[PDB]
Amino acid sequence: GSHMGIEYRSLHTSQLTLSEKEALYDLLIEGFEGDFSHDDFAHTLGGMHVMAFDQQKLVGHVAIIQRHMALDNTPISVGYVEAMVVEQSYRRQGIGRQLMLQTNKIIASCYQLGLLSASDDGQKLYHSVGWQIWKGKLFELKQGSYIRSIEEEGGVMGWKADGEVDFTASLYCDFRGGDQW
Amino acid sequence: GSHMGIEYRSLHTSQLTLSEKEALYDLLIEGFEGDFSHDDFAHTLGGMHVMAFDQQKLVGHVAIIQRHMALDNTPISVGYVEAMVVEQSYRRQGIGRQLMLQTNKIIASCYQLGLLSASDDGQKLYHSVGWQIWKGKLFELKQGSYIRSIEEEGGVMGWKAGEVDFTASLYCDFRGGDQW
Numbered sequence: 044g045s046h047m048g049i050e051y052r053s054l055h056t057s058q059l060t061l062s063e064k065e066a067l068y069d070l071l072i073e074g075f076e077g078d079f080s081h082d083d084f085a086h087t088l089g090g091m092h093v094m095a096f097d098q099q100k101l102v103g104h105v106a107i108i109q110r111h112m113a114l115d116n117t118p119i120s121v122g123y124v125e126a127m128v129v130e131q132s133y134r135r136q137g138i139g140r141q142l143m144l145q146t147n148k149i150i151a152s153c154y155q156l157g158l159l160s161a162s163d164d165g166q167k168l169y170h171s172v173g174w175q176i177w178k179g180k181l182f183e184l185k186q187g188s189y190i191r192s193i194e195e196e197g198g199v200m201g202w203k204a205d206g207e208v209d210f211t212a213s214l215y216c217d218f219r220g221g222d223q224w
Numbered sequence: 225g226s227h228m229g230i231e232y233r234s235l236h237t238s239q240l241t242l243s244e245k246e247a248l249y250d251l252l253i254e255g256f257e258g259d260f261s262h263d264d265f266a267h268t269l270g271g272m273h274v275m276a277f278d279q280q281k282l283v284g285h286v287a288i289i290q291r292h293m294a295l296d297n298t299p300i301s302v303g304y305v306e307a308m309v310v311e312q313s314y315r316r317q318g319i320g321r322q323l324m325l326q327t328n329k330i331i332a333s334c335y336q337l338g339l340l341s342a343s344d345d346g347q348k349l350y351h352s353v354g355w356q357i358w359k360g361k362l363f364e365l366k367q368g369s370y371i372r373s374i375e376e377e378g379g380v381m382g383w384k385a386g387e388v389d390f391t392a393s394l395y396c397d398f399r400g401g402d403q404w
């Protein structure tokens with residue numbers, strides 16, 4: 044739909060054209076001012092994109108990836124939020140909020156828990172739509188064994204749609220290239 | 225689109241209505257003759273679905289879910305194929321093949337490797353569209369460390385759209401029920 048003149052579309056990676064993927068990369072690399080690696084780009088591909096347009100130009104994005112984690116010893120399906128960006132001139136105008144409202148709806152309909160790793164900019168937005176900083180320990184796979192993600196603790200945030208999740212439990216994430224969180 | 229009198233639609237789990245979800249569950253229960261658990265149903269939700277219809281009746285389905293695995297020591301992004309079924313009276317008319325052609329296209333656009341655990345009904349079909357038996361060892365997480373998935377070896381199949389060593393070990397991500 045469209046909200047205050049911005050069109051929002053929800054598209055799986057498999058539904059994007061090459062031109063649309065190139066436009067997405069340009070938006071993301073600019074939005075992070077270069078702090079966006081090739082591995083970061085891989086991490087935002089493979090799930091659902093919510094994309095914001097002013098006329099025909101892409102001006103905002105967020106992706107929701109499926110991840111498979113453990114909450115303590117229990118398997119938990121995760122909607123992992125990646126690569127939220129609003130083009131500079133469009134910021135503080137509600138686009139990030141609209142992207143997150145649609146992201147929350149996607150997570151609620153598919154997964155048991157939303158997770159993400161926040162920037163300082165992002166944290167205020169995710170707080171405003173009901174996410175909380177994860178309070179428990181974080182673990183990632185290195186060479187096939189779990190190690191503590193000590194530096195990422197305090198930066199990961201979560202959201203439970205249906206009911207309650209123990210924010211103090213330990214999370215064990217699945218393996219990928221680059222940054223695990 | 226359409227193919228040979230059957231309509232095909234691709235959609236993400238997040239777009240399913242409750243009625244569509246219930247119809248999918250009923251199709252899977254009937255098509256697997258009940259060999260399909262609540263965990264199996266969870267495993268087919270969260271990714272892309274390709275659905276086949278005779279006019280308005282759901283007659284076929286396959287899902288592609290994103291998984292995060294290790295190939296030996298290297299991370300590999302996986303399109304994991306779940307819950308392919310065609311209603312019994314519609315079988316052997318090419319619906320499964322059309323579902324797999326669309327599945328291959330989704331995997332090729334999104335992931336580095338396709339993987340699935342086969343049934344005897346599907347194995348020759350998967351072979352016919354490029355899939356091959358995984359020859360390497362399979363591992364899964366139990367109590368936070370990897371153990372060999374010995375019973376599943378020989379039944380997992382893979383598809384490379386590139387080059388992939390089909391003798392490498394695969395380390396899958398953690399879920400409930402059957403890991404493969």
Ligand SMILES: CC(=O)SCCNC(=O)CCNC(=O)[C@H](O)C(C)(C)COP(=O)(O)OP(=O)(O)OC[C@H]1O[C@@H](n2cnc3c(N)ncnc32)[C@H](O)[C@@H]1OP(=O)(O)O
Pocket residue numbers: 074075124125126127128129130133134135136137138139140141159160161162163164165167168169171
């Ligand atoms: C999971 C991840 O992707 S983390 C990475 C987040 N992305 C980045 O850091 C890239 C650079 N930054 C951006 O692209 C943007 O600043 C975003 C995406 C973080 C926010 O997008 P915006 O469209 O500006 O957010 P929006 O206008 O909807 O803000 C909604 C509320 O969130 C809060 N908020 C948003 N941005 C900020 C900010 N920079 N500082 C303080 N509060 C903020 C405010 O409460 C705001 O409400 P208000 O404007 O009425 O005070």
Ligand SMILES: CC(=O)SCCNC(=O)CCNC(=O)[C@H](O)C(C)(C)COP(=O)(O)OP(=O)(O)OC[C@H]1O[C@@H](n2cnc3c(N)ncnc32)[C@H](O)[C@@H]1OP(=O)(O)O
Pocket residue numbers: 255256305306307308309310311314315316317318319320321322340341342343344345346348349350352
């Ligand atoms: C990853 C997974 O989902 S594994 C589980 C697969 N699903 C099941 O076992 C549920 C029960 N079985 C079914 O629903 C169906 O038998 C399916 C989905 C496996 C196949 O669906 P169909 O629509 O019948 O497949 P389709 O008609 O496209 O067959 C294409 C080719 O695959 C082969 N094939 C398909 N089914 C069989 C079979 N039961 N026995 C031998 N060969 C078969 C044949 O070579 C066939 O070509 P042909 O008909 O010209 O001889």
Ligand SMILES: NCC[C@H](O)C(=O)N[C@@H]1C[C@H](N)[C@@H](O[C@H]2O[C@H](CN)[C@@H](O)[C@H](O)[C@H]2O)[C@H](O)[C@H]1O[C@H]1O[C@H](CO)[C@@H](O)[C@H](N)[C@H]1O
Pocket residue numbers: 075078079080083084086124125126127159160161162163164194195196198222224
């Ligand atoms: N002290 C070390 C912190 C550790 O490196 C870490 O958590 N690092 C965090 C790793 C995450 N993958 C990053 O995720 C965010 O940005 C990525 C691109 N840069 C996107 O791909 C990702 O989709 C998004 O979600 C996140 O931004 C990083 O946060 C860190 O970098 C931010 C930018 O400077 C800071 O604002 C944060 N306070 C700081 O913790």
Ligand SMILES: NCC[C@H](O)C(=O)N[C@@H]1C[C@H](N)[C@@H](O[C@H]2O[C@H](CN)[C@@H](O)[C@H](O)[C@H]2O)[C@H](O)[C@H]1O[C@H]1O[C@H](CO)[C@@H](O)[C@H](N)[C@H]1O
Pocket residue numbers: 256259260261264265267305306307308340341342343344345375376377379402404
């Ligand atoms: N000997 C041990 C076999 C081991 O249990 C195993 O690999 N078991 C395999 C476990 C997989 N999760 C199953 O996956 C298939 O069927 C599931 C529903 N039953 C779907 O959810 C799944 O989406 C699909 O992909 C797969 O079919 C099972 O295969 C086994 O059961 C099949 C049906 O009887 C046989 O035809 C196979 N030859 C046999 O290996």
